[PDB]
Amino acid sequence: ERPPRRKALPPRTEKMAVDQDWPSVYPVAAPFKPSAVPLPVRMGYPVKKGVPMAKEGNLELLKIPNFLHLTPVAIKKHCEALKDFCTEWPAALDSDEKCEKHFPIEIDSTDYVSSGPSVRNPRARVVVLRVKLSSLNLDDHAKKKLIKLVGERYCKTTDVLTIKTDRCPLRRQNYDYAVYLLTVLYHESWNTEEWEKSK
Amino acid sequence: KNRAARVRVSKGDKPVTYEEAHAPHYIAHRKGWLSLHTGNLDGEDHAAERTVEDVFLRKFMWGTFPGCLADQLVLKRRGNQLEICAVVLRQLSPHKYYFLVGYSETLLSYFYKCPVRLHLQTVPSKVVYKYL
Amino acid sequence: NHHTYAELMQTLRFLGLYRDEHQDFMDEQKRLKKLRGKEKPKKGEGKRA
Amino acid sequence: LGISIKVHEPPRKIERFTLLQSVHIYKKHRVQYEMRTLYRCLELEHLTGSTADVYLEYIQRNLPEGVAMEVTKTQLEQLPEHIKEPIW
Amino acid sequence: SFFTKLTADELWKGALAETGAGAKKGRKKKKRKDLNRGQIIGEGRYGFLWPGLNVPLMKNGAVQTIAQRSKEEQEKVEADMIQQREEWDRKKKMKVKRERGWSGNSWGGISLGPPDPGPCGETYEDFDTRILEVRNVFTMTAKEGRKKSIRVLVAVGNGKGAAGFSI
Amino acid sequence: VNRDTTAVPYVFQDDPYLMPASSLESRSFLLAKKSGENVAKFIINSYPKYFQKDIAEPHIPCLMPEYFEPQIKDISEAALKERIELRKVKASVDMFDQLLQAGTTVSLETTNSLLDLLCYYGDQEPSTDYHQFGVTWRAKNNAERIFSLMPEKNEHSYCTMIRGMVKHRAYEQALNLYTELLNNRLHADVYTFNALIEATVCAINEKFEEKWSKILELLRHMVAQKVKPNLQTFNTILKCLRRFHVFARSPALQVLREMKAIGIEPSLATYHHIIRLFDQPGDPLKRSSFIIYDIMNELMGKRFSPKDPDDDKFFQSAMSICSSLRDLELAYQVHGLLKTGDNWKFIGPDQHRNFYYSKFFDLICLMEQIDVTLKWYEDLIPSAYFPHSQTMIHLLQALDVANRLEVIPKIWKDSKEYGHTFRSDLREEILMLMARDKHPPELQVAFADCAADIKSAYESQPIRQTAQDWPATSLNCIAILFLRAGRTQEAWKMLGLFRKHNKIPRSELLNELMDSAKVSNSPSQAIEVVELASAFSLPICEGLTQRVMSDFAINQEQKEALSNL
Amino acid sequence: ETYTEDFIKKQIEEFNIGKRHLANMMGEDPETFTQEDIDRAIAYLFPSGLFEKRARPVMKHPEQIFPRQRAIQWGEDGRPFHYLFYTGKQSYYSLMHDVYGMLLNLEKHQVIGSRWLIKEELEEMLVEKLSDLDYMQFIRLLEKLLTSQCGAAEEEFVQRFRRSVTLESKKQLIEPVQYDEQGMAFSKSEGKRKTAKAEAIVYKHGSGRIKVNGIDYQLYFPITQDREQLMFPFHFVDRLGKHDVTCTVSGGGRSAQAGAIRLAMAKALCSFVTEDEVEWMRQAGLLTTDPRVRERKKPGQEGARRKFTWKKR
Amino acid sequence: HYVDWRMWRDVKRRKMAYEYADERLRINSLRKNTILPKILQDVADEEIAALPRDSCPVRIRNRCVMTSRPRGVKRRWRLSRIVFRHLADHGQLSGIQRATW
RNA sequence: GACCUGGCGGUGCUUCAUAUCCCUCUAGAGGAGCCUGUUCUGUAAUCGAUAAACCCCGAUCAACCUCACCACCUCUUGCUCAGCCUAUAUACCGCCAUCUUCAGCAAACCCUGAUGAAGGCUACAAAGUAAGCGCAAGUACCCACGUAAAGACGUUAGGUCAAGGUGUAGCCCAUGAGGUGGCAAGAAAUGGGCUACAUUUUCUACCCCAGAAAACUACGAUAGCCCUUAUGAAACUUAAGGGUCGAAGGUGGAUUUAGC
RNA sequence: UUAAAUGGUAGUUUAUAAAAAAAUUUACUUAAA
Ligand SMILES: [K+]
Ligand SMILES: [K+]
Ligand SMILES: [K+]
Ligand SMILES: [K+]
Ligand SMILES: [K+]
Ligand SMILES: [K+]
Ligand SMILES: [Mg+2]
Ligand SMILES: [Mg+2]
Ligand SMILES: [Mg+2]
Ligand SMILES: [Mg+2]
Ligand SMILES: [Mg+2]
Ligand SMILES: [Mg+2]
Ligand SMILES: [Mg+2]
Ligand SMILES: [Mg+2]
Ligand SMILES: [Mg+2]
Ligand SMILES: [Mg+2]
Ligand SMILES: [Mg+2]
Ligand SMILES: [Mg+2]
Ligand SMILES: [Mg+2]
Ligand SMILES: [Mg+2]
Ligand SMILES: [Mg+2]
Ligand SMILES: [Mg+2]
Ligand SMILES: [Mg+2]
Ligand SMILES: [Mg+2]
Ligand SMILES: [Mg+2]
Ligand SMILES: [Mg+2]
Ligand SMILES: [Mg+2]
Ligand SMILES: [Mg+2]
């Protein structure tokens, strides 16, 4: 033991200036490091005539998912760098009514972000297609036949046809199937069969 | 009398940490959870596999760092990442710590097929919350 | 897969990279039993015949 | 980033279940556990594919441990070409 | 199974059986042996030498590589460790000669050393304490019944005339 | 985000006990971590079974075990190709021989691939996890035997054999094979020509003029064969021309001028070779001055990409030229180039990075205002490099020149934090500067506190186990610093150390001890000052004693003083 | 846990530096960063859901964290500073002495707003531990001092030990009277009974028509008792047949829904009656939310209160 | 290395059932209808009965993965009540707390 | 012989039990059928709990599997650097019952009894000061209410070697491992629950302004028999419905449970 | 101030405490014979 037991250096928070660039200290999400956070933050239910425990060796603070990497300064700086990637919403589509006129169909899909080694989620395949029958070129006969073919998929109050598809493994296959069903429904509604005279 | 995870009062000479001093009825009230993942949220899958992995990791780290851990692990999962936060003592030489961090991070990444990081916090001695 | 977990951590103990406190405990007890005179009998050469 | 956002808090879900107190017999005595699932819904509006891709990547990468996310994306589409007029 | 294994503390707590019903109302005191005392990190049965854990990281200014002790070298290490255990165990077996009092098993006439020094810079190194009687007195309590207490008479004196006793 | 100046590199564990505290610990801590990764990889590949359960989606190929053993056990040409892909030099040769003995046909391409494997590795197994000087090429090697065995030998076979010989320092044998290549009327490739250039210069020890003629002849051979030179062709020429101390400078510039005309863009390696050639230990450095200035003008604001293995060696050499020329503006231009874009990645290995920054910071302290030097000190240390003990001396000298000695106590603390607690040169320098002149009371108190800390470092020396060493200057300085701050009690103890260690006290220390005793008016103490100097037979003592006798001395003590001499 | 004064001084030194660091992190002015801004920042940076607020991360002025500790009571010579030191309660008995002295002098010369300082808060003032009987004795003198014609100085001394009870007013809060497109005055209120939640719109002028979910009240509530509950608020103030009500009720059963509407109508009708009538309504139980809700079943029992059959043998 | 022989017997049953699942599904489809002739449905009855007994999915038991306890297991975590409570009471299961209301 | 402490007293006095001791209040159990445990008896054929504090209890669960039982057959370095539901809960860890619908436990000191076991309060105060643990506070649920949770030290060598782990002892050609088939019944007694004995009822419509039924064709089986279907490889057996059948029961002794 | 018997045998109390270790050992490329 000619050199004595290695001594821990003093914490580097004592070298930090009060006007530092904090986003540089915590660039990404990292666990709470008491030697790097220059705050006398205490945590822990105090014992009688006691104070909340100090930050060094404090397992309660380690458990907290801290937001030291997302200080308001960092978020504003981050988004300034991310503006280059964004594209501008069409100004014409000011209101929801204007969106419906130009783009009658709405495709709903869902992505699930969970923690674990596998990203797979069987719920992500579901695709919902909604279209108002007033946006479709349907005559009187066709509209009546369509409403009968789809059944409960049609809502009279809203006049929206909801086609949910989840047969195929992938979302892209369910999207193609939903679009296909709308096509064959449209064309079958227009077709008039001889047995329809028995109505 | 209830027993679960209750350090029983002694002659006032036994040091206990903050985690060890709080009985199970204090979880979510005075102490938090030692593992954070989404398995146990409503509508989330694979709670069973997350549980087994946690039990293994706590044992692996106990044997790989024998006599070093001064408090329970804090397992964190963010997406694909696994982060092990360990409060260790300042007895083992730094060289041996760096070897074990590189070894444990690599071996566990290949075992659970995911990026694993180990964040060691060193304390001079066990942090005593109270003496029971 | 209890075969992988058990066999893996057994290998890690023989390599000196895992300390199995459980296995150390039952190893000392087996060593002390042998000295006390309690040892597993050889297969076939049992106390019975 | 110039995105229109509205936040509302859907009601929480508390799932409770009961277990036996003792390892053996003593049926009357139970331990009751729960898992509380709290929600927050961020409703974005009038985004383009590029804007949504960047915003989602930014907030998803910074999702705190123990928080799940379900992103429901409503895409505006035009009528399929085949549906413009009947073939019969 | 790996998952059924426990820590040493839980194992020793169960094996020692210090807490129980057989150790209460006077109803073998084996002692816990620390098995990690002589174990070094990186030492295994196979004998692999790991740069930076079991063996020095750099030898001759060159980072060592993974090596393995020869069959005969590992046998020496195991045999030496076994011998080092028999020595440590031997020390505990040794009985230190206690100076007996009036009788072999009697507490009377056994010195207790100097009285402990007082907090306000007071030292009592001149005085010699020696026990006179040790009695196991008993009372009866509603909850536990026979409750054992120790009554201890002692005498302290410096040898120059000062002398007292207390219970 | 930018580099955090208060933190050590990110690769290290951000913990006060685990953070590296010296330049060596930095290297060793990373080496230990890399060893841990190697041990894990060794286990993973030794026992793949335990790591074959794939639970990752999407699948991660990089996190799977690696299998290095040939899985085709049939004796065939197709099964042989596997062993060559696995880089099993011994297995491939043994199997190739067995294949040849069986009489089955091995394709020229397969035979050429085997030669590539043998020629590159010199018929020796590549290093594995677990199971310099001289010519590594050996006459009885498998490549030579197989090369002769070949029924048909194409241009590539000869090429790879020549390249192997040059790689393994068989320069004369490579040149002989090229002569055979020419006798067969076979065109050589660019890579063979680049190896042949190196062989010419290394093979014989002829004067520059002859070697230059030979090199030019190969270039004329290259043009005759319609072979277009690559960047490496010119970089080897310049690297080869470094051996000719003062005869290759102008020719080397001609080579550079030729590159630009052809269209080959000089990389960082090209300029590295030039500055190394032009910078020989000579005081004027007149030619070197012109070269570096012109090179830096050309390279200004150029983002570089990896082109030559020697690209990483430029920045360390460029900074070395700036330190020799003692031009700070040029150094700032070199550093500016490093910081543009992604050029910082060309700094090179650790020892390169330390050398570069040492020469850079040593030039700042000398040539720049103290206020800016201290900013560079804060930014670079410890975040960029751990300072050498001599750089702290240069920083102390810069502080002396600037008359900013209030920072000396801080430098000591930082020195202790960077592993210079027990460096004798640094400890002696600090004490001398603090005690050189008298200072105001507040500065004198601070210096006394630092002196006490340096004294504690001397008391707790690791060398103390070996022996007790207390330099005379250090002891004298510490004692004087205690006396000036008013800690006479502490100074009085140092007098025992002087005689104990046989260190002679300076007259200035003795002359100033008078006032301390006079202010106290304790004749006993006054004699102690006389008694000590008398032991050393200092001439000042005798003249001093008489003055003390006049001021304050007991009658009985006066008589004893004279007899003691 | 003995915190010396130098230690506390260093803790204050670290709070001021930390306070400036936190302002820099949050992009706020270091000079106007308050304690309420600190708490907001700490809550964001260190989000803790622990139900007990005393266990959450805190960054407060060390004077507010560390407990108030009494100063050294003797110098280096050893002579205690206070003449009543050896009593053991020098601060309590010093006060007791003063009040007795004042009372002697006063004799020789001759409440809803505020409560008597509680015991735990008097101990803090004195920084001494007291018994309940000690507190009673002290209060018994302070009261005696008020009974006598205490002078202006004595009144100030007493008021040191009198805190201020802010008395909650038991007065019903009246909803604003709004006007529809047609200019009819109406008030809207809310009620809740068990799981039923009803919104009632009471019109100032009407014929007595009550619509429940768009249905006439006698058709919606076929059970007479339910219709009796709807009558009670209006009958109590003699305003049957003078208002129209449009109420919507959801959840609960038939009785809970009738109870929720009763509370909603009563709260709304307070806008169109006199203050005195509002007080009578409050004293008849027409404006109180009934807290009686279904109690949960417990494990190991048959119901909320009922047990399983007990067998002695 | 499985907790006991009973767990080991269940491991083999889960493996054999997986191997035969497709064959068993196909044969059952022949049996579970009124379309196909009863003669063919009788032959399928015999064929499915001749498959190894341990392929029958009803023989699989959801045992505690840690202790092999066949009862008191929570299917979501695959743990017996005793093992689950041990991990829950130490705060090692994310989001599970004692329920009080 | 005389004491200390505790327990106990069909021991005194005073003050009281808040679903609580008595008198009172409401609905039950004890009687009938059936469901489901237990004890006995039975079977070649588990085990544990078994005053309060066992008895729809380990089981949020047994047709095979589960399984540990029985009969027969087979295997031997054995799924494991073996195994064992083999003995010992009177060796233990772990997790608990119980008093507890409690408020006490105790380190460190001081004093009293002449320095005995031991004892330590009086507020117009007479030797106690007490960290710590519990209660309390705080928190969860809808409040500051209530209800949960909490509940120390100890008592019953209380329950659990059969959750798992484990000390001691035992088996190792068997007390271990696998295969097939099989038993889990009712003379008798009893615990808990379910449905009823009806008119404050039965059926239908409706979810509250109705019409019928109403004593041997009424009320009343969730049993028996038969049939179909569901799950499964396997259903005399497990579950659902249909048909058929229309039974004891006519408000229940001593005794006994719960509820503010 | 009604009456209100019983509870197998033995077993329920004294000699001490605790390991120690060890370092790594300060600033390029390059080349020559
Ligand atoms: K008594
Ligand atoms: K009854
Ligand atoms: K056992
Ligand atoms: K056993
Ligand atoms: K019953
Ligand atoms: K006996
Ligand atoms: Mg309980
Ligand atoms: Mg003896
Ligand atoms: Mg089953
Ligand atoms: Mg009955
Ligand atoms: Mg039984
Ligand atoms: Mg029994
Ligand atoms: Mg069977
Ligand atoms: Mg069976
Ligand atoms: Mg058996
Ligand atoms: Mg017991
Ligand atoms: Mg409350
Ligand atoms: Mg309770
Ligand atoms: Mg409480
Ligand atoms: Mg017992
Ligand atoms: Mg028993
Ligand atoms: Mg057997
Ligand atoms: Mg009926
Ligand atoms: Mg029936
Ligand atoms: Mg069937
Ligand atoms: Mg009938
Ligand atoms: Mg008798
Ligand atoms: Mg008796």
For the residues of F460-510, what is the DSSP string, one character each? T-THHHH-----HHHHHHHHHHHHHHT-HHHHHHHHHHHHHHTPPPPHHHH
Chain B CB contacts of G48 under 8 Å are 32
Query: Which residue, among A27, A25, A22, A26, has the nearest Cα to A81 in the 3D structure?
Result: A27
- Greatest pairwise CA separation for chain D in angstroms: 76
Alpha-carbon distance of E163 to F5, in angstroms, equals 70
Do G15 and A42 form a contact (C-beta atoms < 8 A)? no
Phi/psi of residue F379, nearest 5 degrees: -75, -40
For chain E, give the residues followed by a break (C–N over 2.5 Å). Answer: 27
List the single best residue of B22, B27, B30 to mutate versus G (max G Cβ within 10 A).
B30
Query: Which residue, among A38, A44, A41, A42, has the nearest Cα to A19 in the 3D structure?
Result: A38
Chains C and A touch (3+ CB pairs under 8 A): no
Do A100 and A135 form a contact (C-beta atoms < 8 A)? yes
Please judge whether C6 and H3 are an interchain contact, meaning their C-beta atoms are less than 8 angstroms apart.
no
Chain B CB contacts of H85 under 8 Å are 4
For residue E2, give the nearest of C6, C25, C28 by CB distance: C6
For residue F156, count other CB atoms closer than 10 A to its CB. Answer: 17
List the single best residue of C2, C10, C11 to mutate versus F (max F Cβ within 10 A).
C11
Do G242 and G250 form a contact (C-beta atoms < 8 A)? no
- Residue B1: strand pairing partners: none
Cβ-based neighbours of F154, under 8 Å, separated by 6 or more: F108, F112, F186
End-to-end Cα spacing for chain D: 49
Going from N- to C-terminal start, the domains of chain H cover 1-91
Residue G179, SS3 per DSSP: strand
Alpha carbon A168 to chain centroid distance?
A: 23
Token pair recorded at residue G82? 């206070």
Closest approach of chain A CAs to the CA of B12, in angstroms?
A: 15
Q: Please state whether strand J lies within 7 Å of residue F130 at its CB atom.
A: no
Alpha-carbon distance of B39 to A33, in angstroms, equals 27
Q: Which helix (H) or strand (E) holds E157?
A: strand E145-157
Query: Which residue, among A55, A70, A66, has the nearest Cα to A31 in the 3D structure?
Result: A66
Q: Please name the residue ranges forming H helices in F10-150.
A: 23-46, 77-85, 89-102, 108-121, 142-149
Token pair recorded at residue A199? 């109505």
- Comparing alpha-carbon positions, the chain B residue that sits nearest to G57 is B30
Alpha-carbon distance of D65 to F428, in angstroms, equals 54
DSSP 8-state class, residue E52: T
Q: Tell me the CA–C1' distance in angstroms for E24 and I5.
A: 20
Query: Which residue, among D39, D32, D34, D30, has the nearest Cα to D12 in the 3D structure?
Result: D39
Q: Is F512 exposed, middle or buried (0-12, 13-18, 19+ CB in 10 A)?
A: middle
Alpha-carbon distance of F307 to F272, in angstroms, equals 13
Strand-strand pairing, E67-68 and E48-49? antiparallel
Alpha-carbon distance of F362 to G2, in angstroms, equals 51
Do A127 and A166 form a contact (C-beta atoms < 8 A)? yes
Strand-strand pairing, B81-89 and B116-123? parallel
Phi/psi of residue A23, nearest 5 degrees: -50, -20
Q: Tell me the CA–C1' distance in angstroms for H2 and I58.
A: 24
- What is the full DSSP assignment across F126-138? PP-S----S----
Angle ∠(F58,F64,F70) on CA atoms, nearest 5: 130
- What is the full DSSP assignment across chain A? --S-SPPPPPPGGGG--TT--GGGTS-S-----TTT-----BBSPPPTT--PBPSTT-HHHHHS---GGG-HHHHHHHHHHHGGG--PPPTT--SHHHHHHH--EEEEEEEEE--SSB---GGGG-EEEEEEGGGS---HHHHHHHHHHHGGGEETTTTEEEEEE--SSSHHHHHHHHHHHHHHHHHHHH---GGGGG-
Token pair recorded at residue G5? 């004064």
Query: Which residue, among F71, G51, H62, B17, has the nearest Cα to A62 in the 3D structure?
Result: B17
Q: Which residue has the tokens 């108002």?
A: A132
Q: Does A70 touch chain F (CB under 8 A)?
A: no
Closest approach of chain B CAs to the CA of E102, in angstroms?
A: 34
Query: Which residue, among G103, A32, D26, A169, has the nearest Cα to F15 in the 3D structure?
Result: A32
Chain E CB contacts of H65 under 8 Å are 3
Alpha-carbon distance of E11 to E19, in angstroms, equals 13
Q: Does H91 touch chain B (CB under 8 A)?
A: yes
CA dihedral in degrees (F378, F383, F388, F392; nearest 10)?
10
Q: Is B90 exposed, middle or buried (0-12, 13-18, 19+ CB in 10 A)?
A: buried
List the single best residue of D26, D28, D31 to mutate versus G (max G Cβ within 10 A).
D28
Token pair recorded at residue F458? 């001397």
Say which experimental method was used: cryo-EM
Q: Measured CA to C1', what is the nucleotide nearest E145? A: I6
Angle ∠(E93,E95,E100) on CA atoms, nearest 5: 160
Alpha-carbon distance of F273 to F313, in angstroms, equals 9
Residue D78, SS3 per DSSP: coil
Alpha-carbon distance of G24 to A74, in angstroms, equals 12
Please judge whether E4 and H1 are an interchain contact, meaning their C-beta atoms are less than 8 angstroms apart.
no
Do A81 and B77 form a contact (C-beta atoms < 8 A)? no
Helices and strands (H and E) in chain D: how many: 1, 5
Do F165 and F203 form a contact (C-beta atoms < 8 A)? no
End-to-end Cα spacing for chain A: 103
For residue E52, count other CB atoms closer than 10 A to its CB. Answer: 29
- Comparing alpha-carbon positions, the chain C residue that sits nearest to F43 is C12
Chain H CB contacts of B58 under 8 Å are 92
Chain H CB contacts of E1 under 8 Å are 1-3, 66
For residue E94, count other CB atoms closer than 10 A to its CB. Answer: 6
Residue B7, SS3 per DSSP: coil
Alpha-carbon distance of C27 to C47, in angstroms, equals 24
Q: Does E4 touch chain B (CB under 8 A)?
A: no
Residues 5-44 of E with CB under 7 A from strand J: 25-27, 31, 34, 37-38
Q: Does H2 touch chain E (CB under 8 A)?
A: yes
List the single best residue of E49, E50, E53, E59 to mutate versus B (max B Cβ within 10 A).
E53
Alpha-carbon distance of A126 to A163, in angstroms, equals 11
DSSP 8-state class, residue F74: S
Token pair recorded at residue G155? 């009144």
Do D36 and H95 form a contact (C-beta atoms < 8 A)? yes
DSSP 8-state class, residue E115: P
Strand-strand pairing, G210-212 and G244-250? parallel
Please judge whether E2 and B59 are an interchain contact, meaning their C-beta atoms are less than 8 angstroms apart.
yes
Residue E62, SS3 per DSSP: strand
Q: Which helix (H) or strand (E) holds D4?
A: strand D4-8
What is the C-alpha R_g of chain E? 27
Phi/psi of residue H32, nearest 5 degrees: -95, 55
Sign of CA dihedral A48, A54, A56, A62: positive
This structure's resolution (Å) is 3.0
Chain C CB contacts of F47 under 8 Å are 8, 11
Chains H and B touch (3+ CB pairs under 8 A): yes
Residues 114-133 of E with CB under 7 A from strand J: none
- Comparing alpha-carbon positions, the chain H residue that sits nearest to B2 is H89
Q: Which helix (H) or strand (E) holds F356?
A: helix F350-367
Sheet with G215-216, side-by-side order of all strands:
G178-179, G185-193, G196-203, G244-250, G210-212, G215-216
Q: Which amino acid is at B117?
A: R
Residues with Cβ within 5 Å of ion ligand 7?
Answer: D 29
Task: Please identify among residues 40-99 of chain H the ones whose CB lies closer than 8 Å to any CB of chain E.
Answer: 65-67
- Residue B16: strand pairing partners: B130
For residue B26, count other CB atoms closer than 10 A to its CB. Answer: 19
Nucleotide I232's nearest residue (CA vs C1') is: H58
Alpha-carbon distance of G295 to G304, in angstroms, equals 6
Q: Which nucleotides of I are covered by protein (CB under 7 A)?
A: 4-7, 28, 48-49, 51-68, 76-85, 90-99, 105-107, 113, 115-119, 123-125, 130-133, 138-160, 162-174, 176-180, 191-193, 207-209, 231-234, 256-260
Angle between helix H5-31 and helix H38-49 axes, rounded to 10 deg: 170
Do G278 and G172 form a contact (C-beta atoms < 8 A)? yes
Residue G123, SS3 per DSSP: helix
Q: Please state whether strand J lies within 7 Å of residue A7 at its CB atom.
A: no
